[PDB]
Design a protein around this nucleic acid. Structure first.
Ligand SMILES: [Mg+2]
Ligand SMILES: [Mg+2]
Ligand SMILES: [Mg+2]
Ligand SMILES: [Mg+2]
Ligand SMILES: [Mg+2]
Ligand SMILES: [Mg+2]
Ligand SMILES: [Mg+2]
Ligand SMILES: [Mg+2]
Ligand SMILES: [Mg+2]
Ligand SMILES: [Mg+2]
Ligand SMILES: [Mg+2]
Ligand SMILES: [Mg+2]
Ligand SMILES: [Mg+2]
Ligand SMILES: [Mg+2]
Ligand SMILES: [Mg+2]
Ligand SMILES: [Mg+2]
Ligand SMILES: [Mg+2]
Ligand SMILES: [Mg+2]
Ligand SMILES: [Mg+2]
Ligand SMILES: [Mg+2]
Ligand SMILES: [Mg+2]
Ligand SMILES: [Mg+2]
Ligand SMILES: [Mg+2]
Ligand SMILES: [Mg+2]
Ligand SMILES: [Mg+2]
Ligand SMILES: [Mg+2]
Ligand SMILES: [Mg+2]
Ligand SMILES: [Mg+2]
Ligand SMILES: [Mg+2]
Ligand SMILES: [Mg+2]
Ligand SMILES: [Mg+2]
Ligand SMILES: [Mg+2]
Ligand SMILES: [Mg+2]
Ligand SMILES: [Mg+2]
Ligand SMILES: [Mg+2]
Ligand SMILES: [Mg+2]
Ligand SMILES: [Mg+2]
Ligand SMILES: [Mg+2]
Ligand SMILES: [Mg+2]
Ligand SMILES: [Mg+2]
Ligand SMILES: [Mg+2]
Ligand SMILES: [Mg+2]
Ligand SMILES: [Mg+2]
Ligand SMILES: [Mg+2]
Ligand SMILES: [Mg+2]
Ligand SMILES: [Mg+2]
Ligand SMILES: [Mg+2]
Ligand SMILES: [Mg+2]
Ligand SMILES: [Mg+2]
Ligand SMILES: [Mg+2]
Ligand SMILES: [Mg+2]
Ligand SMILES: [Mg+2]
Ligand SMILES: [Mg+2]
Ligand SMILES: [Mg+2]
Ligand SMILES: [Mg+2]
Ligand SMILES: [Mg+2]
Ligand SMILES: [Mg+2]
Ligand SMILES: [Mg+2]
Ligand SMILES: [Mg+2]
Ligand SMILES: [Mg+2]
Ligand SMILES: [Mg+2]
Ligand SMILES: [Mg+2]
Ligand SMILES: [Mg+2]
Ligand SMILES: [Mg+2]
Ligand SMILES: [Mg+2]
Ligand SMILES: [Mg+2]
Ligand SMILES: [Mg+2]
Ligand SMILES: [Mg+2]
Ligand SMILES: [Mg+2]
Ligand SMILES: [Mg+2]
Ligand SMILES: [Mg+2]
Ligand SMILES: [Mg+2]
Ligand SMILES: [Mg+2]
Ligand SMILES: [Mg+2]
Ligand SMILES: [Mg+2]
Ligand SMILES: [Mg+2]
Lengths: 70, 101, 116, 87
RNA sequence: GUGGGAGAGGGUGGUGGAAUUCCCGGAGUAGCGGUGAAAUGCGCAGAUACCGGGAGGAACGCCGAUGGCGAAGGCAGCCACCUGGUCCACCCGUGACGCUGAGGCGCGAAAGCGUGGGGAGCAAACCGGAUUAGAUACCCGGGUAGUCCACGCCCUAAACGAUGCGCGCUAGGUCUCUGGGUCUCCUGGGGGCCGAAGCUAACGCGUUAAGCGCGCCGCCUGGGGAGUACGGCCGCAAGGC
């Protein structure tokens, strides 16, 4: 499978308000994908985690979701 | 004085009488705390990822300001007073860290 | 005596019992069943067979009110979690969708010694 | 905190000559400002013990330099002390 | 000094969603719960399961790491203010200003003490139910102190790398965090794994030394009696040195 950084443009990892790209980092649930799946570096991942959590408080990213399967 | 970004979500049911007042109330409180404005982005109605105050949407305001640092928390306290104000998040402005550059 | 004809079926599966509630589309329940509602008494409630007959009993109970379509909601890890869904599919009630909504805390309340 | 605007006013005040950034007079001046800034932060915030350890170290550093000045040129030590109001 | 950096380092205020419990309403019957089986328990005064509203307390899922920070204890939601340590580049300034450190002074997980709050979940003691030859236990149902906050004590620990601090020297390889660079790589500062020489009783250690040297502090001198007795200092007590 592809990684998220691999299929994406040049984006601001620090902009908490850009949902279209930030949504691509959550999973089927609201969970923040691991580095195995985001292709991010050690430092980039630390920044993403913090920006996603910021967007979650503005109401733009979901804290958790429901899985439609099983 | 440092530079911050003010994010303000308000109730997305207001008419023009109410929206203009709540916004000019925001203008008034900024003047009172010494916050010079630099630019503003008004995004308006936005689908929320979870219900906030039983309402599935929010009305969004973003401000880039330069104000004294000691007065930021007193500015937040004053903004959150209004009923129609739902979220106040004041972030210290940062450099736009690029990725996949 | 209601004629709802479409609604939700919550499967609550724990290791000691499986129990099924069938509600109208806005969540108010209609009928329900469990491993204890059918004959079983003890540890046999948390068996997959009990889960089967439980789902099926609540299914036939909802037929009386005229249900056809069902949106399945599943909570918990337990034996006969899958066995109860498979019963609901075969029950005749057309299964619209299936969602696992098991509530997991964000690590807030200290668990009983059993769960640490 | 301590902005470079304030920093430079102190260095240019205590420099033995223009361009001197590392004199013992310049160091103990700079330290003394950091000491007061911290002890005022510690007047309130009495429960901040980790920051307090940093203060115990600046105090020691200041005293080692004064103890050094005292040995080499005791006149410049008297002038430094009375200018900063210490000991 | 200057210019940059990363970070659950500390303190204060504010704030977000998930979950548990409780209350209100709706809808809805005959059980739920729990175990190896059970039973005590709860349920017709309507529980369990389900939708909605509210209250309150505690802890932060994913990110999360074999990761980072701190002198140690220890430190994970997010925001803001106050603040400590530290690393790198420049080769600018001072001109041996250094190292260690008996005593002193401060910090010091958990449990415990005092005063006043707080109290959702958990839970010593305790009340029950089981198991059992017995059960002063493991398993089950309850439950008080306590766990949480403020202020003041207490000073213990497998407080562990069971490895005191600083400096110099002595093959490399590989993984990694974070800087700088003429950016297959080079070069620092951390975190790991193999391993030269060498050391070690052995296991193992090996540029993060348990190698080679030097400086300084602490400490040991067979087991039991015993961390006891006595004396002293500390403590409200428990008790500690
Ligand atoms: Mg408000
Ligand atoms: Mg059972
Ligand atoms: Mg948990
Ligand atoms: Mg706990
Ligand atoms: Mg917990
Ligand atoms: Mg477990
Ligand atoms: Mg459970
Ligand atoms: Mg678990
Ligand atoms: Mg488990
Ligand atoms: Mg556990
Ligand atoms: Mg577990
Ligand atoms: Mg310069
Ligand atoms: Mg912190
Ligand atoms: Mg903090
Ligand atoms: Mg805090
Ligand atoms: Mg009720
Ligand atoms: Mg009964
Ligand atoms: Mg009960
Ligand atoms: Mg009870
Ligand atoms: Mg009864
Ligand atoms: Mg009874
Ligand atoms: Mg509810
Ligand atoms: Mg309460
Ligand atoms: Mg969890
Ligand atoms: Mg977990
Ligand atoms: Mg983890
Ligand atoms: Mg974790
Ligand atoms: Mg660690
Ligand atoms: Mg470290
Ligand atoms: Mg530890
Ligand atoms: Mg700092
Ligand atoms: Mg020079
Ligand atoms: Mg010279
Ligand atoms: Mg000389
Ligand atoms: Mg000492
Ligand atoms: Mg002293
Ligand atoms: Mg202690
Ligand atoms: Mg304690
Ligand atoms: Mg107490
Ligand atoms: Mg309990
Ligand atoms: Mg118990
Ligand atoms: Mg026996
Ligand atoms: Mg605790
Ligand atoms: Mg420890
Ligand atoms: Mg030994
Ligand atoms: Mg020891
Ligand atoms: Mg060395
Ligand atoms: Mg580079
Ligand atoms: Mg290294
Ligand atoms: Mg190897
Ligand atoms: Mg090997
Ligand atoms: Mg090999
Ligand atoms: Mg050898
Ligand atoms: Mg050997
Ligand atoms: Mg060997
Ligand atoms: Mg080795
Ligand atoms: Mg060397
Ligand atoms: Mg050495
Ligand atoms: Mg001794
Ligand atoms: Mg003897
Ligand atoms: Mg013996
Ligand atoms: Mg012995
Ligand atoms: Mg013995
Ligand atoms: Mg003995
Ligand atoms: Mg002994
Ligand atoms: Mg002994
Ligand atoms: Mg004895
Ligand atoms: Mg002896
Ligand atoms: Mg003892
Ligand atoms: Mg004696
Ligand atoms: Mg005594
Ligand atoms: Mg006494
Ligand atoms: Mg006693
Ligand atoms: Mg006793
Ligand atoms: Mg003792
Ligand atoms: Mg004793």
């Amino acid at each position: 499978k592809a990684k998220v950084k691999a299929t994406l443009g040049e984006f601001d990892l620090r902009d908490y308000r850009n949902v279209e790209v930030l949504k691509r980092f959550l999973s089927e649930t609201g969970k923040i994908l691991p580095r195995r799946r985001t292709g991010l570096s050690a430092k980039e991942q630390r920044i993403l985690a913090k920006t996603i959590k910021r967007a979650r408080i503005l109401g733009l990213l979901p804290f958790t979701e429901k899985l439609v399967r099983k | 004085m440092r530079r911050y970004e003010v994010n303000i979500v308000l109730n997305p049911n207001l008419d023009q009488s109410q929206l203009a007042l709540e916004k000019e109330i925001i203008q008034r409180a900024l003047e009172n705390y010494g916050a010079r404005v630099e630019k503003v982005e008004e995004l308006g109605l936005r689908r929320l990822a979870y219900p906030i105050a039983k309402d599935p949407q929010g009305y969004f305001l973003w401000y880039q300001v330069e104000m004294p640092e000691d007065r930021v928390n007193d500015l937040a306290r004053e903004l959150r007073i209004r009923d129609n104000v739902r979220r106040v998040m004041v972030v210290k402005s940062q450099e736009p860290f690029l990725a996949n550059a | 005596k209601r004629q709802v004809a479409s609604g939700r079926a919550y499967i609550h599966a724990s290791y000691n019992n499986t129990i099924v509630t069938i509600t109208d589309p806005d969540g108010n329940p209609i009928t329900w069943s469990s491993g204890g509602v059918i004959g079983y008494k003890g540890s046999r409630k948390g068996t997959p067979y009990a889960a089967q007959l439980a789902a099926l009993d609540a299914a036939k109970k909802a037929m009386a009110y005229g249900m056809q379509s069902v949106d399945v909601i599943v909570r918990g890890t337990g034996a006969g979690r899958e066995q109860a869904i498979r019963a609901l599919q075969a029950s005749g009630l057309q299964v619209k969708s299936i969602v696992d909504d098991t509530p997991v805390p964000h690590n807030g309340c200290r668990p009983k010694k059993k769960f640490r | 905190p301590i902005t470079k605007e304030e920093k430079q006013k102190v260095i240019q005040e205590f420099a033995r000559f223009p361009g001197d950034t590392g004199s013992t007079e310049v160091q103990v001046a700079l330290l003394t400002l950091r000491i007061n800034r911290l002890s005022e932060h510690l007047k309130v915030h009495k429960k901040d013990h980790h920051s307090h350890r940093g203060l115990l170290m600046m105090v020691g550093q200041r005293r080692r330099l004064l103890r050094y000045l005292q040995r080499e040129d005791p006149e410049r030590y008297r002038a430094l002390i009375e200018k900063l109001g210490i000991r």
